[model samples]
Target chain A: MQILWKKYVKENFEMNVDECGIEQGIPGLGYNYEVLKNAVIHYVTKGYGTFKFNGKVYNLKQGDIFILLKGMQVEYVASIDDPWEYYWIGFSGSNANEYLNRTSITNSCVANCEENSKIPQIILNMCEISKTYNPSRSDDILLLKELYSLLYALIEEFPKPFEYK
Target chain B: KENFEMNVDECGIEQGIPGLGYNYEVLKNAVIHYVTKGYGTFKFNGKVYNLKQGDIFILLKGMQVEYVASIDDPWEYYWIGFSGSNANEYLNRTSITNSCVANCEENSKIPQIILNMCEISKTYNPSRSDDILLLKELYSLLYALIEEFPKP
Candidate 1:
């Protein structure tokens, strides 16, 4: 399991289920889908699929996640017949990658949710925050905080080696 | 004095040589500095901040920072590489604003505090007791630096 033992500040961020919500049979998600200047969290809530990253392909099950980096040769793909539904957040910041490094995702870009994970609700909270996010410094700060919280939720629920590194 | 929150990655004192300068680069560790003597310039995030005796400043996580010392007044300072969860939060709340620049009322106190931190953190090899002591002293120094609060 990944650890949320460490907390951090997030500099750049965006989150969602997007139009990719409740998805299945995604025609050709076979190539890596990453931001040229950002990092993203790809979390599947339902169904099953496969993800390839870090010179490996990971089987995707309900409540599984992939911390996809934007650098060249990243990873992603769909089973088509059994494509999974997922949530995601693309963010860039000095703290972003470091935050993930504290997790198992550092070695492997994967995080999991329990069968009764609160991830679905957390995703929903993010969407709600996004909908009301305005063009103001305070609003933007709120958004950043929300993203951090969501990311925290992803890691906080699990067990780990150390809560502090 | 007391551990508040965070981890100290590294800390030390440096007496930079003339032409002693670090090229521009992004920071992986959050750092704080106190120039005890001489002068220098630090350029980061499109701004230039002068570092002179008694001037304290910080370079946060991810900032692309470059610094150099003056030939005549080569800078000497104390610095610590520190980072963590609530640590960043406390940074956000106090004198350690995102702006990265801060002033101590009694600027002289800054160097001593930093030096103390460097000494304490190295007093012992890694251990739970030492770790806790280091973290506590780091926070005490941070508060002395502009520091606090409840969980959000």
Candidate 2:
């Protein structure tokens, strides 16, 4: 399908939207430097996919998410014949380690989870909103607000082991 | 030396006078001899001056000097007249001489009028009938002189 991607950079971290195709049952694997930093990958579409990272195969379908800490290896296998589209916002600032620890995805993965049904619609809404406004303006604050809200909703869907303080 | 006699009062300086030749030695000798004979009430830049013989006076382009000579012993001078692009403008301003004459250091740069006239004279050829080329050279020399010696 159509993939719309955007990236933003501040002082220490970069946020990116990744949307593309990964054939069904194809293991798409790649690794980057594992400095003392934390990263979070939020699946906005929840397409049928298997994400393998940190010595575990996470079966994710709709609203499923994952977190990779510093020094962790990540790879994924998608069952979809086409590409699995998703949004990934990563940060590595001073408090990134603490923030990621608090928001780490813990349900391991959600398989055919009904709670994730609204995720795709939210992603579509976000994409539309982002397209309508200038990302460089202060109006982008609302975009970040929506992103944080979506993350909160996803966290609520899959309860993690650690309580967020 | 052949004596060329032309009365200043009778000589009317006109534009585009063909076959006019000015010799520098004539004007220099005239200025020197006249000043030596105590004939220096020359008006320049709205002021009158009395310069002794052998004294060098520098006048920039655009300055006007009222030439005065004794009728009995006329100031015999050698002068070369030439015009270039900036001639008309340079002739319009009549105070540029004051600055040049006041800053009369021997090492000072030459006046624009003399400089332009020399440039035009050097490029001038009596046989050349190319008016356009002559005018172009004149314009270039005039421009160079004016640009080099901008009025204060």
Candidate 3:
């Protein structure tokens, strides 16, 4: 069965918010360290992976979430043992700092299988809303708000044990 | 002296005074002269106007004008000009035509025209090279003008 893939790409796609697509039965590939402005990545399917960012390596499973702060250099290797499927949303604007502060999803990855499961539904809702309504400044704002809410909910449900200074 | 008035239709070039402020007799003579000089265009009430040197250019007592020398001329002619009781206000109101003026005034670089005509007079000159300089001066003037009358 064919599945639908949803990707949101904005300006500076390669440098700021680049994503790697991995298909079933394929080994997870390695990404070189790339400087990124603020960005968020959401995984849609179950997979095993290890992501390296800012001198730290993270083991990610299904429903894993990653947040890259502006100016952070990040790299990741898909799990050769168990590959996963995921979705990513990246955005940046003048008010990015304010949104980051409010959402508290900067410079770290919060993993939650439960939260990841809900991503497909949210993505479907966004697609439906986008089809009916033309995107505008107001619409983009709303999307950002919803994304923030999702990230906040994920963090609340899956609190990281260690805090970074 | 009794008030004596006569209307002589004239073109801008013939009027001898390229601007406002000429006395009635001077205006009449200028209008006659303008007819002799040549035909030209003037704008009044948001409309195009064509008049000969002798054609009378009638500006009602309270009418406002934005005057200039003919487009083809090197040196614009000169003569006395006057503004009736409300002329100054009218000119001030029509001065703003762009956003740059509004921006400058918001920054407080100049003063409104009504408070002092020196800025306008100083900036409004006959020199051809003054175009760029005049534009800058106008920007400052507009900045000052809008500050005086801001949107409610």
Candidate 4:
């Protein structure tokens, strides 16, 4: 497996883009057990994978996104034949849960995107911005903007009961 | 004003460049600028606009305009140059379609959105896939501009 990770923070906003990355998993590559302090979202861009959360295994494919909620234990494995390539962004803030609850994935921890969905590209965009260290105030705001854009896209994809307003 | 404008396919963030300004000229492609800091003067036809932080300026294709930064304060901004099939319709949703400049609050979401776009442009490596990603980012910026339209 190959992975690249970038980190960011904006203390005043209470939101930290803890990490952003892209991972290409080898066949059968798996992380059997893990827990995190920050919420992490993975959007599959290619191949397939199995995400284990709360004792259920979800078969995920391209255009699928899975969230690992903070403090949750989960396992994930790449498909033996096709492996998987995914982009991820990990973030946490005082209002992180509030924002997550606003999205359709909060309840089920997963959302299936339509073909040509822009979610993966958005994640990639965040990862690229993360490459900059010692980010200026503009860069900090940029990261936050991208994070909000991602959430906004997810909300659009799976409109909530109150979102139509 | 100097080094204020350049023909480019992507957007960019310009900070501090003192005395940056563009001479009166018509552009082949439409362009927009979101001022995040400092001040400048925008000249469109016979009218001159004194612009500061949070100001937005739009120059449609074929329109001649001149702008110069404040010698002391200058201006920091993000600018995007674009021309597309739906450009007219896309811009029609905002006041930008009618006015050449709009003064927004200093802390409006427009600055954040534009900065976000400039960040993406800075990192874009430019391949077929990267171009796709860049376009998506640009559309996201447009969406924000449309919905948030500066309410000064």
- The lDDT for every candidate, in the order shown, is 0.58, 0.38, 0.40, 0.69
Worst 10-residue lDDT window, candidate 4 chain A: A133-142
**CAPRI band of model 3?**
incorrect
Encode model 3's per-residue lDDT on B1-152: one tens digit a residue: 01011111211222333433222322221110112344445454566555443332333333444333344431232121332222233223432321111212233433232223333344543222222222223233333343444433
Better of 2 and 4 by TM-score: 4
- For candidate 1, lDDT tens digit of each residue in B1-152? 22223567888788888867886554655788888789888787788887787777787756777888888989998888787664576566454555576555553345666877777766754322344345545655655554222123
- Residue B23 of model 3, lDDT score: 22
DockQ of each: 0.03, 0.00, 0.01, 0.04
Once fitted onto the true fold, the runs of candidate 3 whose alpha carbons sit more than 4 angstroms away are: A1-25, A113-120, A123-145, A151-165, B1-152
Model 1, runs deviating above 4 Å: A1-165, B1-5, B107-109, B126-128, B147-152
- Model 2 ranges off by over 4 Å: A11-37, A44-47, A80-83, A91-99, A103-124, A130-133, A160-165, B1-152
> Model 3, retained fraction of real contacts?
0.00
- Give the lDDT of residue B55 in candidate 4: 85
- Rank order (by DockQ, best first): 4, 1, 3, 2
User: Over 4 Å off in model 4, which ranges?
Assistant: A9-13, A132-137, A163-165, B1-152
Error of 1 at B6 (Å): 1.8
Query: If both were scored by DockQ, which would come out higher, candidate 3 or candidate 4?
Result: 4
Candidate 1 vs 4: which has more DockQ? 4
- Name the lDDT value of residue B20 in candidate 3: 35
Q: What ordering of candidates by lDDT runs from best to worst?
A: 4, 1, 3, 2
Q: What would the per-residue lDDT of candidate 4 be over residues A65-139, giving only the tens digit for each residue?
A: 998876677888999999999988888865355456656677778889887676777788887777664442244
Location of the lowest summed lDDT over 10 successive residues in candidate 1 chain B: B143-152
